[PDB]
């Protein structure tokens, strides 16, 4: 069989999760999916280590699917380190483990149900290409993803048919004390109708309060921001411009059982093919004590089967860093009030939106 660990933290409909376990028709693949579920609150990271180590020592599971209700980024890092030593896959389908880290360990098999920073960067070029928007301005802070965000944008303009040109690539630094003047000067040179911003959720408030002092909030000026700044769509700092457009995962249409079913499907499908061809069940040593001595065995045979997985016609494939090649992305635009409403989706380079012409 296949050892599957589905873990749900917080308030969730656990009954519907167990429904998809039997409803997943793997008769032709004959994966024999054994799903063992443990439900517990967030509590401590040590609980996750205690639960994973004990469970992997109990039934010798060959895969884990993790769903969380907390948005803290620390959860993602822990399981990434767990997979490196436990030598077992971990899937952060939803929650604090779903958000994507810039760098993933080579020896770790933690995969995420989310888009990379570069993946979101190309989407911004897709949405604003339709409306004949070609003049940008990249506004970036010292966040670690700023270089990747601006390199991907620049690398798509270099040899493109469309008349794409970038005006200013100013990079700010609010780490220094009393940075009001220095930030105000740099933000004062913006002239482009469209401005692309990359910062934190709190740093966007700092930028927007001083951008309003300059006045970069008119109806003729549009701001394109990734999911990192928006974070939770509920909280609005009352400084976001009326007309901000952001991209994010399609969390509205993707439920926890829906992600669980995808979490079961990706692990089960990959483990069936390797048993058919390689025919080697991954059974590492059950004890976490002296893990270095137990590195004699390997578990990378199943690693490249998780990379390429198709299920019900969906290319549920994964890269080396854990993000989805073709994730479900949704575009949200601020309405008259401070509420985020979906406008369209991007999937498999076939972006479609429900709003035409644009106001």
């Amino acid at each position: 069989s296949i050892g599957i660990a589905v873990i749900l933290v917080g308030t969730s409909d656990e009954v519907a999760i167990k429904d998809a376990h039997e409803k997943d028709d793997f008769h032709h693949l004959s994966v024999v999916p054994r799903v063992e579920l443990v439900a517990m609150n967030e509590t401590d990271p040590k609980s996750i280590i205690t639960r994973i180590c004990d469970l992997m020592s109990d039934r010798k599971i060959q895969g884990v699917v993790f769903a969380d209700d907390t948005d803290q980024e620390a959860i993602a890092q822990i399981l990434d380190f767990i997979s490196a030593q436990t030598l077992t896959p971990i899937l952060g389908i939803h929650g604090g483990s779903s958000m994507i880290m810039a760098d993933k360990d080579e020896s770790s098999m933690f995969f995420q149900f989310g888009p990379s920073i570069e993946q979101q960067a190309s989407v911004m070029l897709n949405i604003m290409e339709e409306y004949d928007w070609y003049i940008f301005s990249i506004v970036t802070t010292y966040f670690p993803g700023y270089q990747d965000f601006v390199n991907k944008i620049r690398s798509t303009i270099e040899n493109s048919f469309v008349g794409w040109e970038l005006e200013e690539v100013l990079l700010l630094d609010m780490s220094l004390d009393d940075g009001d003047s220095k930030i105000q000067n740099q933000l004062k040179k913006l002239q482009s109708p469209i401005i692309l911003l990359y910062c934190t959720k709190e740093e966007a408030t700092y930028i927007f309060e001083v951008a309003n002092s300059v006045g970069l909030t008119g109806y003729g000026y549009t701001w394109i921001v990734p999911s990192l700044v928006a974070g939770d769509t509920d909280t609005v700092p009352a400084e976001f411009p009326t007309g901000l457009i952001s991209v994010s995962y399609d969390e509205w249409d993707y439920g926890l059982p829906a992600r669980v079913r995808d979490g079961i499907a990706i692990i089960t499908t990959a483990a069936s093919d390797m048993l058919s061809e390689h025919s080697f069940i991954p059974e590492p040593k059950s004890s976490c004590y002296n893990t270095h001595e137990k590195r004699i065995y390997q578990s990378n045979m199943l690693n490249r089967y998780l990379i390429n997985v198709t299920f019900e016609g969906r290319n549920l494939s994964f890269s080396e860093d854990g993000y989805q090649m073709h994730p479900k992305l949704v575009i949200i635009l601020l309405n008259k009030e401070r509420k985020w409403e979906r406008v369209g989706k991007w999937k498999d380079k076939s972006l479609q939106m429900k709003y035409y012409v644009w106001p």
Partner: protein, 49 residues
């Protein structure tokens, strides 16, 4: 004309040369790749670069 001018350049600036005609047979232009939204040169311009 151009070879006789090239030999003068080679003699005056002291470099050695190996000539080869364009494999493509074109002069040089920026065209469309096979459905990738990218532009590539061809001919001499795409050989020099």
């Amino acid at each position: 004309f151009c070879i006789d001018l090239l030999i003068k350049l080679a003699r005056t600036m002291n470099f050695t040369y190996e000539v080869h005609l364009v494999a493509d047979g074109k002069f040089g232009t920026q065209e469309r790749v096979n459905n990738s939204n990218k532009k590539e040169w061809n001919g001499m311009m795409g050989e020099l670069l």
